[PDB]
């Protein structure tokens, strides 16, 4: 219900990339984690995901310290991680994807698994392609399958790593409908991205890292008005 | 499970493809080498092909651990490279469950290779050798037409020709006593073996006693019996003797050598290595696992395949070196036959602790 | 650079593989030898004791250093002793004797007690004793010096051919 | 002048690292060979170090062309993936500069391989021959003597031994396999046996206090010899072609002609391989590097296999090494020009 | 002066990618080439550059048959190409970069090369990075070095491939500056990118391709008003 990073820090061979980055996301809200290229947005994002260990800081979900837990452990504690790369199981049916994700969850019986799987397939309009392997899907279809698979592990917070990775303007509205649907479905989505316009257009809040030591959290109108990010991150006057 | 089934399916397909490729390379090489000597007898291209096909089980048995390491590396590489082991972790499927999926799919492989090394590889190689000797000189019994010797305790025998498997010709028995000075020479023309009495029957024999100098009393008889510890099985082995035979037959022949009085360390070593071979297969898969989950985390395909091929090569080298190195200090042959598997397991487990 | 290359790698690997597949003073010294030559029906023929023996397998020839040949009868009784400095054994059982060839009569029943020559030939199968150089036959009552010798040990006989002179001890040997 | 220096500096760094790795590999191979031949009873730890360090020109022979070849593959691949060569071509520069820099590096490695072949090879071979001929008795006497029951077509004889106390036998039994016109196989048996080889080149087997039993076909005639000291002849890294270029030019024998053409073609291989590798160094994101180098590595392997086969066959009088050696080189030069010109204006129109 | 690609077409192993793309560009203007993913924009771009061998189509510059000659020969006839990744030479100085490209053209003397190097470095604010190796530059610095190195070969047209590649707006306004300066220098720049907002904001003549077919041509104000482009690629809610 409440994911929170506190004093996140990381260094690489005597070089400081991030130190004291603390962002917070709650259910039913979209939180962007933005910043200039090299500022440390993706480092702290990954350090919340659990693939990048912390040198200093804390990651908490509902009064549970997940700071030392790897990616599998933290994924069990309701942290779904959706990367930008093609993360579908190739040479497996979409149903096998869901079932592979379900058989690890000890919270359902042999039949409730299949029930939830069919519910997800009807939910994401991917009912057409049920037997097609992962090697034969298109763009949007594979994206929806990957979001369903990532939901099938029952995540309290979905961490999107660069979801706007080279998408035509005709499909960004579809991805925004999906992220609004996930927000309206009582999920906390943590979006890190390089595209600033479309990310700030859908994020209710946004933390703007810069040099990995400071942020400016606020609404899109409160972020656009701040002169610090207007200069270091934005430049002159921006046109949304 | 399902992830267990999917990992298993991909790793098994990739190990089988790798093994087919290594077997086809060594086969083309052995085919050209065998055709090189296809001038004598009615040995044609078809016959050289047949000798390679019948020898395929020996090649798969030899290239099994290398193909296991390479295929596991390429399988789990395609899984990692396509960012799927990360998804498995992103869904809660831990790395230990992935390692377990691999180990679970490692069981059919060891069963397959044991079955082959027991009934398919030795039978196939023996049939190939016999077919080659039959197409060139009219039988493997006619291939050993040069008179050979064998040892039974303090006695030696010389056989001039072999007429099948139960009938021998031209036998000469030099029986020495406990001091090498007391000798008797028993010659014979035909031998028969009956398992009912479990002895040999010689026809048209003549003995010579040499206890008394200046005498040479020679006695001639028509029917005699020879009670020795060798069997047509042992005759086939001493004819063939390439140390590539059935583990059961290898155990019987070791029991024959320890009874007759020879250094059976070579056969013991190859027996222990032929039964440790499926453990080496499993060690190789485990070392591939450790590579992917350790040093070779994010390396491209080329790095993985060249590190795989070099490690398989140094495993073959370790085996070929520590084979005879057992006789430097006369250490047990089982210890030497286990050293390649043990060392590669130790490397693999060292990479899974990382400290 | 995917389509035709598949056949190019195929052909190149094939050629490499077929290329890998195609590319893949004596003879017998000894010393102090005690040989015992027996008859074909057992029994015994003689015994040869040498101090050093070389043998060439290329030519099948043996050389015996300081040979001593003791020949027996059909009843295994030392009849003759034959010392020499060297012996040449060929492949036809004919033994040549070079240097200090001295044949003593072990059994006192022989009429011929001693023979002395430098070169001798002996046929071992027939126990024949020939010599083309100067020989000397010592008897119990006489000694004859000849230019050639012919005889047989099995028959215990020997005679001299070309230039033969004979001496006796106080009077002559009766004959 | 600047880009050519760049390409030379980068390919040299790569070639130096590849040479180091190749040295380690070939050192391991030679160590294996030396330690194998040493426990056989031929050299101790004092000769192991010398021989390991001394056979490095034979390693260089094969690795110098290889180090330049793999270095050019690796470095041109790295500059292809990093978009540098593409922007050279986008600035009007063509493959001429690349093949120039290649041939410069080929010159350097060729001078080194030529110096190696002309002087460093024969000197080290002569030193090795003298060292190996110096201590020969201690080798032979270090015979492991572990052939316990070993009989095959190695002179057509059988040898059995009961126990071995280090370079010494117990209850030794030798037998023949030749019938030789219906006769008994020669049988000898003794109590102490020593094996000593490499005295003159042939294998010698010496026994003490033995008995030799021979005879005819089941007739009672026997030859029973009591021998005291028995010596027989029941049967490695020595160098033969350790001559200078002048003597090879003047010898004109089979061995010398083969060796001479081998040395020249080995110094030519540097330039030839560096010329072929330039248009075969592009890597594809689909295949990667090791798979994109694969046909070029196969060419290199096929070339060396042919050359080694030609040498081995010519020095035995099977072929004329000159004709076949330079026919192969001609074909490889034609292939080089073929795949070096096909991507140019005249051959594109062609 | 003028670059024309008439009736240009291409296909890959039985799938048609380009079907009669006829593209014309002049000097002193900015022409963009945009389209949906998998249409054939980048394919025809590379085919005009010369990396991809053409299958059917003519390419000319000032009535010169330029279809069959290699990339280096297209560059010698006045064509510059800027790839998307870092094309700067890493283990060379910036001055060595400029000098190594200058010393290829035979229409300059040994001293004019130094003059052109120094002039360029002054033009793009690189005087303070002369001896600095190329592997230790920033984004804007490396971009400037690469474009000056491309200008050192004196090209008639410049073809940019993905100039706005993961760029924050503070550096987008610098690339805009750069393009505007390159247009005002009497050169014809051809943009191929996905950042359509800043592209059309800077581009003055836009071409749109779909399924290997040119849709519509004209100013961005006329392109954004075309209903077919709005229905095929962008959408009805796109602005600058
Ligand atoms: Cl289930």
From TrEMBL, chains A, E:
GO CC, any one term: ATP-binding cassette (ABC) transporter complex
Membrane topology value: Peripheral membrane protein
Ranges where the ABC transporter domain occurs: 3-236
Key words of the record: ATP-binding, Cell inner membrane, Cell membrane, Cytoplasm, Membrane, Nucleotide-binding, Translocase, Transport
InterPro entries xrefs: AAA+_ATPase (IPR003593), ABC_AA/LPS_Transport (IPR051120), ABC_transporter-like_ATP-bd (IPR003439), ABC_transporter-like_CS (IPR017871), BCA_ABC_TP_C (IPR032823), LPS_export_LptB (IPR030921), P-loop_NTPase (IPR027417)
GO BP term (any one): transmembrane transport
A GO molecular-function descriptor: ATP hydrolysis activity
Keyword GTP-binding in annotation: no
Subcellular location: Cell inner membrane; Cytoplasm
Regions annotated as coiled coil: none
Pfam families tied to this protein: ABC_tran (PF00005), BCA_ABC_TP_C (PF12399)
NCBIfam families in alphabetical order: LPS_export_lptB, PRK10895.1
Quaternary structure note: Component of the lipopolysaccharide transport and assembly complex. The LptBFG transporter is composed of two ATP-binding proteins (LptB) and two transmembrane proteins (LptF and LptG).
Entry similarity comment: Belongs to the ABC transporter superfamily. Outer membrane lipopolysaccharide export (TC 1.B.42) family.
Function: Part of the ABC transporter complex LptBFG involved in the translocation of lipopolysaccharide (LPS) from the inner membrane to the outer membrane. Probably responsible for energy coupling to the transport system.
Name of the molecule in the record: Lipopolysaccharide export system ATP-binding protein LptB
Organism this protein belongs to: Enterobacter cloacae subsp. cloacae (strain ATCC 13047 / DSM 30054 / NBRC 13535 / NCTC 10005 / WDCM 00083 / NCDC 279-56)
Organism lineage string: Bacteria, Pseudomonadati, Pseudomonadota, Gammaproteobacteria, Enterobacterales
From TrEMBL, chain B:
Pfam families listed in its UniProt record: LptF_LptG (PF03739)
Keywords: Cell membrane, Membrane, Transmembrane, Transmembrane helix
Main location: membrane
Coiled coil: none
Chain ranges passing through the membrane: 8-29, 62-80, 101-121, 275-294, 301-318, 330-353
Signal peptide residues on this chain, from the entry's feature table: none
Role description: Part of the ABC transporter complex LptBFG involved in the translocation of lipopolysaccharide (LPS) from the inner membrane to the outer membrane.
The protein's assembly and partners: Component of the lipopolysaccharide transport and assembly complex. The LptBFG transporter is composed of two ATP-binding proteins (LptB) and two transmembrane proteins (LptF and LptG).
NCBIfam families found in the cross-reference section: LptG_lptG (TIGR04408)
Protein name: Lipopolysaccharide export system permease protein LptG
Provenance organism: Enterobacter cloacae subsp. cloacae (strain ATCC 13047 / DSM 30054 / NBRC 13535 / NCTC 10005 / WDCM 00083 / NCDC 279-56)
From TrEMBL, chain C:
Domain of life where this protein originates: Bacteria
UniProt GO BP: Gram-negative-bacterium-type cell outer membrane assembly
Compartment(s): Cell inner membrane
Primary residence: membrane
GO MF: glycolipid transfer activity; lipopolysaccharide transmembrane transporter activity
Keyword vocabulary terms for this entry: Cell inner membrane, Cell membrane, Membrane, Transmembrane, Transmembrane helix
Membrane topology note: Single-pass membrane protein
Function: Required for the translocation of lipopolysaccharide (LPS) from the inner membrane to the outer membrane. Involved in the assembly of lipopolysaccharide (LPS). Required for the translocation of LPS from the inner membrane to the outer membrane. Facilitates the transfer of LPS from the inner membrane to the periplasmic protein LptA. Could be a docking site for LptA.
NCBIfam families, alphabetized: LptC_YrbK (TIGR04409), PRK10893.1 (NF008142)
Subunit details: Component of the lipopolysaccharide transport and assembly complex. Interacts with LptA and the LptBFG transporter complex.
Protein name, as recorded: Lipopolysaccharide export system protein LptC
